[PDB]
């Protein structure tokens, strides 16, 4: 086509989606990870995770307001990944890399899994 | 912080949100523009438009499944802007620039208004 493109549009949209998350506006699901609860937008979760994409395209699960993750999932690892989904920034540290990679594998977040594998290979 | 960032994350999220729109997945509102209807995600509309942000943060309007725009709004202008919201690409043409600018002013989409004003100033 003969379209023009606004370079910062995608970044600005995500920044606004994160502002809505911070103020709990139009969040439509609670993700339960052991004793912790995380409110989010189903569409953003689906856009970032192969697991949430499969869950919310399911004709029965699409209507659930609560999703319980596998008990092996670490709440901090999930929190770091949820922040990444809404900001593009990943808080990857020596103390959390194993939990973050395990959570990204479960959530089916391929680019996160790839950087974790590379950072782990560098430290061996 | 000591975060790393995935450059293409925001673009990939928006691309996925547009795939959900194309398949009518988890769309939660219909925007009526004269005889035309446009299905969309309230969160994406809010993230792109000052008008939709004000509408869906209203305690009564946040619950509406149908929003009727002002009858002066052109459906093609709206369609072009809705496409821009979900893709960052604006189909700006000599034949549609006036309708697109009028719609962007009504929707409170400042960057679109700015490029329309510049393209109009160049042709005078």
């Amino acid at each position: 086509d003969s379209c023009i493109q606004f370079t910062r549009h995608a970044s600005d949209v995500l920044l606004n989606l994160n502002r809505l998350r911070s103020r709990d506006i139009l969040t439509d699901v609670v993700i339960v990870v052991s004793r912790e609860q995380f409110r989010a937008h189903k569409t953003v979760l689906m856009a970032c995770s192969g697991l949430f994409y499969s869950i919310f395209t399911d004709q029965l699960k699409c209507n659930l307001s609560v999703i319980n993750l596998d008990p092996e999932i670490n709440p901090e690892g999930f929190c770091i990944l949820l922040d990444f989904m809404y900001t593009s920034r990943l808080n990857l540290r020596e103390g959390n890399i194993m939990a973050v990679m395990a959570t990204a594998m479960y959530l089916q977040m391929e680019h996160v899994v790839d950087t974790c594998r590379k950072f782990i290979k560098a430290s061996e | 912080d000591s975060c790393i960032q995935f450059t293409r994350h925001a673009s990939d999220v928006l691309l996925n949100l547009n795939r959900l729109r194309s398949r009518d997945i988890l769309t939660d509102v219909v925007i009526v523009v004269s005889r035309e209807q446009f299905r969309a995600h309230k969160t994406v509309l809010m993230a792109c438009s000052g008008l939709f942000y004000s509408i869906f943060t209203d305690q009564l309007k946040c619950n509406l499944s149908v929003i009727n725009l002002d009858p002066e709004i052109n459906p093609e202008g709206f369609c072009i802007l809705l496409d821009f919201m979900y893709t960052s690409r604006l189909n700006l043409r000599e034949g549609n620039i006036m309708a697109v600018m009028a719609t962007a002013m009504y929707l409170q989409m400042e960057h679109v208004v700015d490029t329309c004003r510049k393209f109009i100033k160049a042709s005078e």
């Binding site: 023009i4 493109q5 606004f6 370079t7 | 960057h111």
Partner: peptide, 4 residues
């Protein structure tokens, strides 16, 4: 704004 750019030419994509």
């Amino acid at each position: 704004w750019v030419i994509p």
